[PDB]
RNA sequence: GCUCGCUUCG
């Protein structure tokens, strides 16, 4: 199996099929705002801090480059590690303090990593 | 010499391999008479020297061959019925090499220091195909010991001696006439010298306890004079004959090789304050003085 | 040995004495031969460092030039005042009656 | 040894037979060869071999006075009682050369 | 490289950020899954999260050995105890999963499910890693034990009533060290018994194909508009990298940005002592374009001095009162008036002569060498020459500067007239 | 003496007593000071160092400290005691003789030009080699006596250090250990560590048919035995464990503890398991395995003289750990002190200052540095040699001694294999500079132009490769170790994580090293053959600068070059302005250096400074090196140790057992560049003389030189030999005194 | 290896071409020339080296070994077999020696100083053996070699 | 070849049941019948015929 | 004066 390319990989997830998938992107430590009226200090912002909504665009640029503007910054994403070992996104929900509901929401195949764009970071000042 | 030797490299012998150790550590292993030295060479004389064909035979003869160099492919195949491992002998490659190896040869080869593998466990199906079954021996061991054969099934000789190593074709360019010689890189004389197209008259060796084993202690002198006078010469530094032969008559005035080491030496001298003096001191004392041996002055 | 280097050192050491400069002998660079040659024979000198010479001894001139030229010696601490030894019957040891 | 600062040992026998038994066995002029190969290693060295190199080739041509102070040079300790015996000079019509 | 094509957007969801959990199977291989396989029960804990998954393996099928089902069943429990089974009937029909842990913090990872146009991301409450876990051989040998035991004490048909009354071994509840302390704290037992401190929680188990997946799998995504500015996430580039990268906390030591972090007035002097002749346009150019060209000015007077359109820094920075000639030893006060004396001479002629200096100064050859060296070059039929060029641009453009700079120079010559009696 | 000596206070700065409980000794802060002498009547005094070489006494500065404690359940503070004495090194920060112009140091009587650095103890200048060891918990791959290719980690922690190995010397893989019986299998091991499924320890292995086929016996033998899981497979690893000579203690079945705890503490030490979780350590083995099993085909054996895997302690280490040891020794006996006063003395309450002896450092730190012999039990270290006596032939012959750099093999055999000139000697150690002898290849000397790293934070680096994409190796299996474009990170020995397109990760490491967020001492290199990203941040690495090259054009310009010598910039400039940079050995081993402007091509990211600097001090004076034979050229170093000449300004003050001066020093004609920088022309050792190369009266056969006896007559030559006389007038017990 | 014979063979004809021409080329009384002739001092391959060029340096009977990955030296390509990559040295001690050739000349002159440094002690114990072997035997009047008993 | 049993992943053996060869795991009562041929070729490296030299 | 270590020397 050739190793694929992220900007392939989204062209035949939408233009090749329809149908939908699971995937697993790793985000940095702190992403690029603040913590809305979260109590504080420049702590981590995680996606626990943020609302629900539109909070950034996936661009497909040409070459293969595959950018994640997640506002003013523009993170890069590439391929993770080839999981090939069965890996099923489920929701364990406790609705009781004594019974709860675990649900098997799909299967995990590709995962990938964003990471900061450091290069432009640093050209930029 | 020996700080007058270089210890230089390079000094193939015209091979441009092999290499031989040849210097002061060659003196060494020459003085001090160990049964086991390092390469040990053996130069073979063949009846046909212009045939190339009888050399590479008597080569293949002499030299250990493994299974796993002439099958060429060996499977474990595990049948609904029987489970059993299967190899199948490259007879082109064999045709190749001039090994006198069929099925039948290494049937007999294999049950042959292999966990007493019965006879009628391995069996020929084909020309070049060889079946072995082997059964749980109830000493910690079960069918599950299939792959300890997959381990060393590979690993048996078929065809040479198994202490050889390595044999090449040396070839001598003289204008009268190339000839053909073995050159040995094993410690078995004996075993070369009884093979099938090999001139055993003049078959020599390095190892001198081989030699001194084998064809006399007068022999392993006359190697060890050759020796010592080779490796003088390989430097380019010259010794009286005379020297040498002096040192070979004192290692070989007992019947036999006693090296230059402190177990020679004692084994030939005789004064206690010598053998004191030179080492094991205290040992030497107490011995001397719980057998109450009276040392002389002479 | 092949010095090459005392030598262009030698060579180097002349051209600077009679110019008046510190030539370098930096390794791997340095001053070439042919800006020293040049410096020899602009002040009259012979552009090998060879010079005609006549023995001192026999009064008559040698039939091979010779190499002169300010060479930087230095002198080592061993002298042979100090390595000098002679020992007579002297003192000898306790344990073992030696010297 | 290389005159390079070598030290070495200088021992006096106390004994007359000692001393007669090295000056017998163990003299310079009975010990030119070594007992490996009969080799003599007690000969010519460097500056030694050159100047007798440059002696005996063939341009060189000596007249009476330079022949005779090189010969005179060597006339000197056990060498002051016995006679010259120039040699005849090789070319003498045209000049008296002494090869 | 422009972005044609694929401009899809993410949206964040947060009704399932306590309740998403990744499950792998580091031994399963993704082609086989656990869908067909019934579950019974999971057990699980809210805090220090350990998932252990009990489920129902088949028995009539051909790839199960019944004999050795009916002898590891005999093996982990007893003949016909039953009161505490590991498998209900006389085969082994239950397998246990359990869970390790991966790591503490699970918030820079994310679940991300892709819609047409849209990826919307959930965070991640926990991730752990499913084994196949070896409990009842545990139990086995236990029981093992126990029967080993009961051995030894059937040694005897029938066994007397032992008089093995428990004398009162009551042990010294002994002060403990405080290293012997944080020993058995740090102990794997202690933290073992810790985690079984808290108490289990039981939970069933929904499959793939139950309705309730597909139900709750909704939950994954966010109702809003296509188009919505986010309030947070617009911090600037230099913002974002001040923060994923937090900080720790010869006279030319300072550096050229340890030098711009200092006031104005510290750049020029620091400048004029390093390198004690430049022109007023290198200075602008080094302090930079931002600075007004008046405060620079009006720095450089207080520490230079006009030498014929040139800045030349002054003696007393150079030389402070407690410092003196490291080749002399002489006061800083005599080198602060040569070097005024030589740059008198020097606004005076462009021509320096070092042996007059050296015998009006009535100083050594080295302090007039080092006072010449910091502001003149060599000049051979010549003598000492003024390192930079006439700079009339600056004279012209401040007549006012060049004024007092001259009235400065005429007050330094009559003190130096006074001095040497000139 | 600013930043360590406050940590190892620090580390130990409550010592209490388990007898009579809420007492203790606290210490608070720990001072050095300037140097004083003792000789006035409980008084102190500012010394010299020249006063200390001619009184024959130390040049030491009291070490104090400001504490609290309790002697009758009343807290006591002391704001300045003093508790010992230690040595000041020339020219440090505490020195009187930094800060100083020359006519200063002639009022101190005191060379200018003397490189310093070196202490005087006892009136005798001793000063501390470099000390060069192997790297630390690093995996070494390398062949047994009997030809097995097997495996060495020699985990070192700031408190234990162990070497923990692997063979094959049966086709299966055994782990040996000094807390073991016997060898055992690597797949017990596994089992044991968390790890029981096969299939997941064949993952972390490798999925390579022939690793497979080579870790098959392993798992044969594993299957032999009835070892299955975790439990099984530590009441098999304590069968093997003995006890360390009856431990003091009651045991209570530890048999399986024990297992646990060597496993998790004592193997692979520096390995962290974060709470009893091995999953990092099995990785780690798991990457051993698979580097043993790859190096057991093609011979790839790791060779130790390679000197990227080298670390050079200075002074300062050393001095650390002996000054941590005296203070726990210190400690260890103030509370022994305390269990045998307190409780028994009488009702007057017991303290501290009455028993706190000052003598026990002062003695400790002036035997260590003048016998030279270090014995820390503490650390089991018995070394010999680190201190020698500075010699003073010359001004060559110290500033070259000063630079020297011993070995680890401390020669006593023929070695032969650390002996040999190693090309990673490049730009870091002389070449040509060796003691010609027995000591040939093992003491080295440090290139002109090189630097010795330091210890960094450690902190930002985890964070800027956990915010590059570095995966958790917890979140994955082993089965990603064996991808061919999957790649691991480390970090000083510790497995950091796995990554791909490891290119992009290098060069933007690189990139924010050069921006000044990242130390610029802090090494990045990649290894394609085992495919491993290798993060050093450790000190004693040696660095060299170089000028960064982009794109066939070096960074260093005409104008940079000009402001530097005007004096608008300095090094630190170009350092900041990613202009010039420091590469490691490891680092350069992945870069291309060009040695001039015209071997630049497409394919170069750095430029060579100035060749010139690969020699070292001594190898410096040599005229046109480069046209000479090397045994020439290091037996003109071995020479320029010995050669005559002055010694500093102050030699006539100085009084020494021997010394050797020229009546007519002359500078060279001919001076490298190195001279002038080393201010060699200051001080010459030698003189010009007009020597003609010829043949005469054949009194000059062999290396024999024929000299001028007018020359000689008029100076040339003439030497000065001053030997010192020394006695003493002691007073003894009696009083009684020598007259 | 028959590539490293190959390029050793063409690097061994340069030097050796270089050095015929040198001698050719070189007039009489020369005193190199002459003292190598004499054979007092020097030989043909000193002043082939010293002159015209200096030889393949060589480390154990063969070429400098990669001392970094896959590359003597960071200043060569990785995977470079070329001669100046692998200790030729194309100038002469006349011209100069360009620091990699510097470098190699180096490490082959430590070789041969460490070679010696443990030949000298090899050596001393086996004449210090052969030595206590062979002192007893003496030649008697008899014409036969006997040993001390 | 190496092979692993899906149930608990401990490594296989080859055995015989009842009725035909099986594959089989020593910690579960997991089985695998074998229905055709099953083989592993290793295909060792053939002895090149080495040539004289001189 | 004994011992050990370093250092050089050929
Ligand atoms: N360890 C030693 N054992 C015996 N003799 C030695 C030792 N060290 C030096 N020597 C004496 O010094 C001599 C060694 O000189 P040698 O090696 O032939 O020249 P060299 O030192 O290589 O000089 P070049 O470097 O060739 O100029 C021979 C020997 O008598
Ligand atoms: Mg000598
Ligand atoms: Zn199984």
Redesign the pocket.
Known sequence: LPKDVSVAELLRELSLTKEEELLFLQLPDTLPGQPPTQDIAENACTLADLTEGQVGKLLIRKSGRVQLLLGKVTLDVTMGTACSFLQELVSVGLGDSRTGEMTVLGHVKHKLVCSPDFESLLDHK | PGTQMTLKTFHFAGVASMNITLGVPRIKEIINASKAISTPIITAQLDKDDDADYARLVKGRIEKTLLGEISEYIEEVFLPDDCFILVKLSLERIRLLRLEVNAETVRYSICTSKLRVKPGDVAVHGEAVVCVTPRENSKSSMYYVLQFLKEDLPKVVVQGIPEVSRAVIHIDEQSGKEKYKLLVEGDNLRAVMATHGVKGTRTTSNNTYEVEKTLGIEAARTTIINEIQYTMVNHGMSIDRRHVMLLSDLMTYKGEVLGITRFGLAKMKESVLMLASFEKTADHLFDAAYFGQKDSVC | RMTVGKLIELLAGKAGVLDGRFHYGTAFGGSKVKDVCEDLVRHGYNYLGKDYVTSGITGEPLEAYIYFGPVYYQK???MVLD?MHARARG?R???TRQP | ??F????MNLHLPQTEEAKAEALVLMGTKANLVTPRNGEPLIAAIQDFLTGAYLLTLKDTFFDRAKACQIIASILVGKDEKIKVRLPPPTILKPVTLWT | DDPVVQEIDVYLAKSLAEKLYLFQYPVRPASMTYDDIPHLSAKIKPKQQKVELEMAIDTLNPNYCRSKGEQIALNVDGACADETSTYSSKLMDKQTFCSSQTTSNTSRYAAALYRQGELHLTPLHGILQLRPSFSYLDKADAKHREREAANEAGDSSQDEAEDDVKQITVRFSRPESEQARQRRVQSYEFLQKKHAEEPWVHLHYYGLRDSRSEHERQYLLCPGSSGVENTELVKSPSEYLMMLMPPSQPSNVLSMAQLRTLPLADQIKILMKNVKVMPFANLMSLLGPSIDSVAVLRGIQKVAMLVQGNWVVKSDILYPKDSSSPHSGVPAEVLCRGRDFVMWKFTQSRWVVRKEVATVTKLCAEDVKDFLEHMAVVRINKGWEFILPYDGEFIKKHPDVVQRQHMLWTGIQAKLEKVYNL | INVEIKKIMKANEKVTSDADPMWYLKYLNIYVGLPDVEESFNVTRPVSPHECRLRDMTYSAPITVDIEYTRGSQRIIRNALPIGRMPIMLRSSNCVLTGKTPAEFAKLNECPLDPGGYFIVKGVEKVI?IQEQLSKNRIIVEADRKGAVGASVTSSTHEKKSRTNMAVKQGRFYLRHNTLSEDIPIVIIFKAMGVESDQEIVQMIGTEEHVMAAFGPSLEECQKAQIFTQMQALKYIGNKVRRQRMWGGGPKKTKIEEARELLASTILTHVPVKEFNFRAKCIYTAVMVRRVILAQGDNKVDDRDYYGNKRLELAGQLLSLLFEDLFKKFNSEMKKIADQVIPKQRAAQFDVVKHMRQDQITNGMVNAIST??WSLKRFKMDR??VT??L?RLSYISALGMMT?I?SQF???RKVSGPRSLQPSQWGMLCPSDT?????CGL?KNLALMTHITTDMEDGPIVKLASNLGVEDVNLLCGEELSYPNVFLVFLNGNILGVIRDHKKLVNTFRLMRRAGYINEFVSISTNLTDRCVYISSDGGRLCRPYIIVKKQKPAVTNKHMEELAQGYRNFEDFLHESLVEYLDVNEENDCNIALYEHTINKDTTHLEIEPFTLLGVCAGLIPYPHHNQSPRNT?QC??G??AMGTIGYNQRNRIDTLMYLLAYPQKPMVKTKTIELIEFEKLPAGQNATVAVMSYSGYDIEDALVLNKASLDRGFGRCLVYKNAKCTLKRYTNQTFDK | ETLEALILKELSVIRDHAGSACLRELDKSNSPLTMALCGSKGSFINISQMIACVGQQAISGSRVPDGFENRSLPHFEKHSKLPAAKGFVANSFYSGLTPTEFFFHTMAGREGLVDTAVKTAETGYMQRRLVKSLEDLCSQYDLTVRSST | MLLFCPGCGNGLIVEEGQRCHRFACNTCPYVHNITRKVTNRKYPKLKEVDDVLG
């Open positions: 080592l601490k061993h390595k003192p040891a306790v344990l | 040894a290389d390079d600062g070598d030290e | 080699l030279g012999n010999q040699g020698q006596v010699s020297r011993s401390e020669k006593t003691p010609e002898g027995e000591a003491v037996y071995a020479m140790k010995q």
